[PDB]
Design a protein around this ligand. Structure first.
Ligand code: MG
Length: 293
C-alpha cells in the first residue's frame, strides 16, 4: 500500500484510537485496521514486508471475525468464515487457485486442508465468495511429501494443473516426454506444480548424478525430487512439473508455490503468452545442466 491503498484518518476520543490505524507485527507484517475505542473493530488489511496485500477481512474485539481472505504470493488464496478465535477453521473454508476460479472447498483446521472438494468460485459480490461444488467425488487433503513418500494419492491429479497441461512426446527435442499447454494463456500464469520427495542437498550432491534427472532445489535446506518409480507417469501424476523440459530459451520459469495439498513446492509459471499445445520449457541451470561435456 504505497500508491493505491487508501491512506486513512483516525481521531482520538479520550486517548483511544478511533478509525484507521497502522500496526507492525513481529514478523514485519503491517496491519492497516479499523479501531473502535483503541481496539480492532471493523475492516482491516494486512501487508507483507513490502506493499503486497496478504490479508483482507475484519476484526471484532481485536480478533479476526467473519469472512476473511488470506493471499499467497503465488496468486492463490484461502477464504472463509473464521473461528471465534480468528483461525481459518471451519466447514466452509476454501483454498482458491491463482485463476481465482478453481477452488477446494471444505473442512480446514487452522488453514490446513482436511477435506477440500473441487468447486468453482461463482461470485463474491465483493465481501463473501460463493462456491458451487463441481460434479464428482474429487476431494483433496493436505498431504505433504516425505523423503520416501511422494503422495498418498499418486494417481490423483491436481485439478487446476489438469485443465492446463498434459504430457506427450516432445517434438522440438530428444528428451522423450514433454509438458504441453492445453490452453492459450498470457505471461505470469501458473501452469503446473513441481511436487516430489523431499531430500537434502548433501544427499543430491554426494550421490550418482544419474539419479538427479528430476531434482529441483526448493530452498537452502531441501531438494524436491521425482525418483524412479514416480518418474513414470503410470506411477505418479498428481503433479507434472518435472516433465517440463529444459532449454536455453525457456517460455516458463520455476517459482515458489504454497499448495493446499502438496505444501511448499515450486510451480511452473509462464514467462510470456503461451499457445495451446505449445511445449513448456524451463531454463537450464544449477540443478539441471545443459547437455555436453
Ligand atoms: Mg528433464
Amino acid at each position: 500500500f504505497f500508491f493505491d491503498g487508501s491512506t486513512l484518518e483516525g481521531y482520538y476520543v479520550d486517548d483511544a484510537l478511533q478509525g484507521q490505524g497502522v500496526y507492525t507485527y513481529e514478523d514485519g507484517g503491517v496491519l492497516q485496521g479499523t479501531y473502535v475505542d483503541g481496539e480492532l473493530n471493523g475492516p482491516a488489511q494486512e501487508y507483507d514486508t513490502d506493499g503486497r496485500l496478504i490479508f483482507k477481512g475484519q476484526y471484532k474485539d481485536n480478533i479476526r471475525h467473519g469472512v476473511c481472505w488470506i493471499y499467497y504470493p503465488d496468486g492463490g488464496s484461502l477464504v472463509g468464515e473464521v473461528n471465534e478465535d480468528g483461525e481459518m477453521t471451519g466447514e466452509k473454508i476454501a483454498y482458491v487457485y491463482p485463476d481465482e476460479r478453481t477452488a477446494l472447498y471444505g473442512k480446514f483446521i487452522d488453514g490446513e486442508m482436511i477435506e477440500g472438494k473441487l468447486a468453482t468460485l461463482m461470485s463474491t459480490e465483493e465481501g463473501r465468495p460463493h462456491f458451487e461444488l463441481m460434479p464428482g467425488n474429487s476431494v483433496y487433503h493436505f498431504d505433504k511429501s516425505t523423503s520416501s513418500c511422494i503422495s498418498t494419492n499418486a494417481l490423483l491429479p491436481d485439478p487446476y494443473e489438469s485443465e492446463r497441461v498434459y504430457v506427450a512426446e516432445s517434438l522440438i527435442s530428444s528428451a522423450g516426454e514433454g509438458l504441453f499447454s492445453k490452453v492459450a494463456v498470457g505471461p505470469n500464469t501458473v501452469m503446473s506444480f513441481y511436487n516430489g520427495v523431499r531430500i537434502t542437498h548433501q544427499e543430491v550432491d554426494s550421490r550418482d548424478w544419474a539419479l538427479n534427472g528430476n531434482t529441483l532445489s526448493l530452498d537452502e535446506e531441501t531438494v524436491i525430487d521425482v525418483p524412479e518409480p514416480y518418474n513414470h507417469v503410470s506411477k505418479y501424476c498428481a503433479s507434472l512439473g518435472h516433465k517440463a523440459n529444459h532449454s536455453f530459451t525457456p517460455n516458463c520459469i520455476y517459482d515458489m508455490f504454497v499448495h493446499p495439498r502438496f505444501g511448499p513446492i515450486k510451480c511452473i509459471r509462464t514467462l510470456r503468452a503461451v499457445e495451446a499445445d505449445e511445449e513448456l520449457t524451463v531454463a537450464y541451470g544449477y540443478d539441471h545442466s545443459p547437455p555436453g561435456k
